[PDB]
Design a protein around this nucleic acid. Structure first.
Ligand code: MG
Ligand code: ZN
Lengths: 101, 17, 153, 288, 99
DNA sequence: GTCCTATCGATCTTCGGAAGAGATTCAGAG
DNA sequence: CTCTGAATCTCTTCCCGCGCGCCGTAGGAC
């Protein structure tokens, strides 16, 4: 059976690795074998905005939004495992995309 | 039932009619 | 002239019914009494009876009922089972020779780890011969993409 | 409901449809792993009622705040689940079917009405011989059952000036053709024609049956079932036992057999199966 | 063995039967005849509607008994309705009448 | 192994019940 | 030629509580 791959994107790291720990553990308990998680490069945007309402110009505040990514690969999903996943609630605020094969 | 105390009730119902 | 005759057969054993007749014809060497026993099938409309190209002899009448998983033929009387018709054979030989995933539609997956689950279509992967249906994982309606053959309409 | 009398009579098919809240089509009740009721089955949530106490199956509503509303995620109506034991459904038979009771009571009511022997009506019903109706310009009587060899004779001796049907359909046409009151007047005057006390008594029975059918609002075809109502599921529970299994229910299995046979008959009639096959399927459906 | 209130059967809401199950004694037909031999009608009505069959009634009775009212509202025995459905599942239209 | 469809659709269901009554077929003759 | 007899068939009936104990879809195809 095809492995199921979960891509987790979150803005807070500790929360992403909390949801990850949950997921890996959950899989391991239901006796599936799971590869990862593997840290996928963090995409940190940036924005420089002039703080002064009028014309100081050299008054920039730099704000960066950092997106954290984790890949959890679960080899051979046993339908019981699928139900394990599918009743548990994964920390919200967290984006999960699943690919199958 | 239409007997005994039930008959009393039914009889009252039919007489008060 | 071997007029076709229709025989009742154990549903699910209909293939074994045709084969068990095929062996018994040769073993009883009545090859001069039987044409072929049709079990039409599409990618089998009626899991049920079989058609046998046959003649009507009392030896053949008992022969077919001597094949396992065969009650007998379907006809007017048990003394004489009847053929089907002239045109009925041709019509059967004719046929023996001769669903879009809507947004918002609720389907079940047909195969894979998500098979037989309550899912809702989220988007249309049309030109790739694929599908994408929302599922209830992690307490979320996470976007999950699947193959086309995973539909259960 | 307050009441003061109980009335019993035959149920017209449209009355049965009035009883029903849906038409059960798929002969499945619940998954063998999950315990949810399969829609359009013997335990359909939207047909008979929700399973949850006051919640819909889809889970969209779990409060009295949405009582009486209709969900669109599963289709079940949310109300008190008790109604689930009162709603009935109906199965529209692909072909007519004789009501067994009225066929084989102590006398044969359908036979008495048609004055046709029980053996012959049973032979007709189980698709063993034809019976000529609307025989027209033919030496074929009003009913005059006739065998397949006899039918093969009539097929060429006469053209379409006769009609010879098989099974309950022929009986339904006979029932549909019964000029009941005129028939009763004729028989009640024919009674004075003879003194056959070995026949006057059964003639009195036949005329009494004709008078009872005339006076009551009952109509002859109502002796032939066309829509079969299904019992509310909560009266035939599929209760589980120790472990992931549900206790066998007799009525559920009888309904399952009937539904499967009837669906097969519909499939064939759609695919134009040969006359022999459809006749056999109709006989099996009647016996189911 | 003695039973006040406990498990109730599903198809018909009459109380369960047995010792290993918290069930009540069966009031047989002979007992019904004996009650009818006396004039006891209220006793029978209670015994066959409130104690056993009418689901709404047996709770309103429970409340009154706790309240100390000792009055019953019989309603109608559910089993009878089940019977009606069982006959209505056939080709029979049997129904209640007003007059 | 799980998950599906279906019923001896090449048998022989038990002979160790009485009975009581209708229903259904058959005689001797008008 | 079929009318009243019997004669042979099917259908229906058999006290009532209690209390355990156990046992409870199947074969073959992907
Ligand atoms: Mg980038
Ligand atoms: Zn719902």
């Amino acid at each position: 059976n095809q492995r199921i791959r979960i891509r987790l994107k979150a803005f807070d790291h500790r929360l992403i690795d909390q949801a990850t720990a949950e997921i890996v553990e959950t899989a391991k308990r239901t006796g599936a074998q799971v590869r990862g998680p593997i840290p996928l490069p963090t995409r940190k945007e940036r924005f420089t905005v002039l703080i002064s309402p009028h014309v100081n110009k050299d008054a920039r505040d730099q704000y960066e939004i950092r997106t954290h990514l984790r890949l959890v690969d679960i080899v051979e999903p046993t339908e019981k495992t699928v139900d394990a996943l599918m009743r548990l609630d994964l920390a919200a605020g967290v984006d999960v995309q699943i690919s199958l094969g | 039932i239409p007997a005994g105390t039930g008959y009393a009730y039914h009889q009252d119902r039919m007489r008060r009619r | 002239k071997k007029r076709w005759y229709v025989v009742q057969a154990f549903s699910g054993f209909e293939g074994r019914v045709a084969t068990s007749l095929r062996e018994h014809i040769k073993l009883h060497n009545m090859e001069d009494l039987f044409g072929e026993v049709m079990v039409p099938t599409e990618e089998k409309f009626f899991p049920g009876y079989v058609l046998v190209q046959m003649v009507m002899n009392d030896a053949s009448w008992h022969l077919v009922r001597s094949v396992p998983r065969v009650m007998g033929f379907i006809g007017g009387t048990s003394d004489r089972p009847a053929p089907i018709s002239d045109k009925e054979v041709d019509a059967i030989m004719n046929r023996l020779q001769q669903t879009l995933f809507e947004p918002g539609e609720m389907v079940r997956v047909n195969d894979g780890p998500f098979a037989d689950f309550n899912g809702v279509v989220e988007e249309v992967d049309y030109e790739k011969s694929r599908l994408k249906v929302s599922v209830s994982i992690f307490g979320r309606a996470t976007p999950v993409e699947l193959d086309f053959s995973q539909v259960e309409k | 409901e307050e009441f003061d009398a109980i009335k019993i009579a035959l149920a017209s098919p449209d009355m049965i449809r009035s009883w029903s809240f849906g038409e059960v089509k798929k002969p499945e009740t619940i998954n063998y792993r999950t315990f949810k009721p399969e829609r359009d089955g013997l335990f359909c949530a939207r047909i008979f009622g929700p399973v949850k106490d006051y919640e819909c199956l889809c889970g969209k509503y779990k409060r009295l705040k949405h009582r009486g509303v209709i969900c669109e995620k599963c289709g079940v109506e949310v109300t008190q689940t008790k109604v689930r034991r009162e709603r009935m459904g109906h199965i529209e038979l692909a072909s007519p079917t004789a009501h067994i009771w009225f066929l084989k009571s102590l006398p044969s009511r359908i036979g008495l009405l048609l004055d046709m022997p029980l053996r012959d009506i049973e032979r007709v019903l189980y698709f063993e011989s034809y019976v000529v109706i609307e025989g027209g310009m033919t030496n074929l009587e009003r009913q005059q059952i006739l065998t397949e060899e006899q039918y093969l004779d009539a097929l060429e001796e006469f053209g379409d000036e006769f009609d010879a049907k098989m099974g309950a359909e022929a009986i339904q046409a006979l029932l549909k053709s019964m000029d009941l009151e005129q028939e009763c007047e004729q028989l009640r005057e024919e009674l004075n024609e003879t003194n056959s006390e070995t026949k006057r008594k059964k003639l009195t029975k036949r005329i009494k049956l004709l008078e009872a059918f005339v006076q009551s609002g009952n109509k002859p075809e109502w002796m032939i079932l066309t829509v079969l109502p299904v019992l509310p599921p909560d009266l035939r529970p599929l209760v589980p036992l120790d472990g992931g299994r549900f206790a066998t229910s007799d009525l559920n299995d009888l309904y399952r057999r009937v539904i499967n046979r009837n669906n097969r008959l519909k499939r064939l009639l759609d695919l134009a199966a040969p006359d022999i096959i459809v006749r056999n399927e109709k006989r099996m459906l009647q016996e189911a | 063995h003695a039973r006040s209130t406990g498990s109730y059967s599903l198809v018909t809401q009459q109380p369960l039967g047995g010792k290993a199950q918290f069930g009540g004694q069966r009031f047989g037909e002979m007992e019904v005849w004996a009650l009818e031999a006396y004039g006891a009608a209220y006793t029978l009505q209670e015994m066959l509607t409130v104690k056993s069959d009418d689901v709404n009634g047996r709770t309103k009775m429970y409340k009154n008994i706790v309240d100390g009212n000792h009055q019953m509202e019989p309603g109608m025995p559910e089993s009878f309705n089940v019977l009606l459905k069982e006959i209505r599942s056939l080709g029979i239209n049997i129904e209640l009448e007003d007059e």
